[PDB]
Amino acid sequence: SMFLPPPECPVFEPSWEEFADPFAFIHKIRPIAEQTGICKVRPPPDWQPPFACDVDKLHFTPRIQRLNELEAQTRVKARDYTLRTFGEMADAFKSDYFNMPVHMVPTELVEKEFWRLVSTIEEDVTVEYGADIASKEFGSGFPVRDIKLSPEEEEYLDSGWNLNNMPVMEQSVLAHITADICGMKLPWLYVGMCFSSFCWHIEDHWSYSINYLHWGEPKTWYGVPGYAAEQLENVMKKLAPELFVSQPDLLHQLVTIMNPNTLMTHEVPVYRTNQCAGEFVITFPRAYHSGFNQGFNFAEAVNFCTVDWLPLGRQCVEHYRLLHRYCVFSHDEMICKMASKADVLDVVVASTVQKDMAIMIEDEKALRETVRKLGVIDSERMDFELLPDDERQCVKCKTTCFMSAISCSCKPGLLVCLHHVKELCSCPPYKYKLRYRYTLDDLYPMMNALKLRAE
Template identity: 55%
Template sequence: MVSLTEVETEFWRLMHSEDTDVVVEYGADLSAREFGSGFPMAPRDSADEYVTSPWNLNNLSVAERSALRFLPRDISGMIVPWVYVGMVFSCFCWHTEDHWSYSINYLHTGSPKTWYGVPTDSADAFEAAMRAEVPELFEVSPDLLHHITTMLSPSKIQAHGVPVYRVDQLAGEFVITFPRAYHAGFNQGFNFAEAVNFCPPDWFEMGQSCIEHYAVFRRAPVFSHAELLCRMTLSDEPLSVEFLVVVLKQLRNLFAKERDLRRHLARLGVRRAERMVFEDSDDDQRECAMCHTILYLSALACKCSPCKIFFL
């Protein structure tokens, strides 16, 4: 039997080789709702005791302590789990989760999955190391790390003083990644895994920072952070004290910033205003034409370009 260490060594040898081609197949990012989940689902498996288990990934993203349950639609990959069918050497490149949320991955069956992770507080150092290692790629695509197409060995990253940790996930085990914790990995052989995101109260500050980060790189978010805050406030569901504290703090900051921006526009001579119900429009119809942020509280428009709206 080939050891995990031997497979790992061969994986990185192939990665670093310039004259060896290897073709692998990876069934990645497959919606559990369309292709089926490894966990029991209602009503199909309503008699199964795990249908309502909080560890069932079909429930975890919308559990009581996850803010994602307040979003108005199911988001594939974040709220609806994705399933993954891997083979030896199939890999997932360095990335963070959408909105810098938490993620949880369960390996249902098959060969181990090898993970590499960088702590949240080393994210900036990791990005600097990546730019130093492949500057020519970042010149072409400054948002390279958003593409999830770049694989660099842990040793090269560690050479820049960035801590990198590893774990071999076995069948029947969960792996959880934290907000803005870069991670990558590969499969040691055939396996079947499932993953989803969740957003507990301590995620909110990171989530707001992520929206600001996305705007710099003109990356469209998956949902409106401001809309999530407002929906939680207006919801009939009672919020925990932890949620109330963070939501109130962020709403105060959000409204203060909104007030200042509107006053600034008034000083610039913007006088005409009309009400718009943003949630009645699809997300792609209310994106800022410049930074692609999904607009919710307000937008700026000009009669010279009536089809375009902009973030304040």
């Protein structure tokens, strides 16, 4: 009556046969899981990667967090904890909060209590946590190559479900990206304590994500399917409009805690789960999610993109343009990079890339015709992929340019995409230059190579 828990999301227990190939399995459950936004995966009982670490030599800098509903927080980017000293702090905190041993505090109660304390202005509970990509002071919880390994660790070295491997796995089109986009393709490590929370969000470029809980107390999740993303945003806009004022950077995105019952009252479908140690949660493209930790724990998560995602990735960049939001990478650049490697591509990949490329080319044709009729006549080839990203964003909409852009000798170094030709400066169009990566005649043979590889 104070808190009504959302219905449970789907839970999968694949056989060893199904579990062998992660991407085939994900594709299998997709028609179910994409209806709920999140889903949980229980590995076969055998599958138990060796977690081993020294709690005294792993150090990290803690982030601090206030727990207030609808209050703005900034997406993550001093002091120092070891894994042991943080664990001691976290267990003492939970123990003193409930005056109970930690394992006897029911998960139902922590959930009820979380939503009570974030709503009450009178309570000012703050908590700490760890969040960073893997490094020398604190590294992956999965086995990696270096130090000699035991026969069990090397079994799990090349698993698909070893999350270090999906940044470079082939069915993930993110693997082929040449640009170092560390924040996005490398795994993040998360050290939780009781009530530490991740706000409502979707992934950059509407990618998938996958989260593994290595050990410790459970992680509670709320998820919304991708088809309801904009319903959720309209509810958020009405109840907390400050979160929507234009962000200066992509290191200035604002997010918040919000009760799922509030969303359910406004007809947004929400699902929940408790993720325990040894379990995976998977999020689908544009599926909103949030949650909190029940106690001291350690998780590891990574973004990825299947061939299924390619059309959504294009729609997402279009959506970023309307919103004037920064991109993490150029989607078109990624497509052309794969086309240029067509001979070594997986054939299903090749077929799906070909379809996206065909849309890209037809859209680019129409845009070039439009700017020609605006009086832009001069043109020159330009290798956009050699420019630092901050040197090739459209002045107006902030999109990362790759296929083409307009420049002018008047504003040296500035660019606009072909949608915003009128937003560069006050000179007449004949002083402008179309800068392009490829002619249409370069592009049709690149697409043809994909067609041949796909057969």
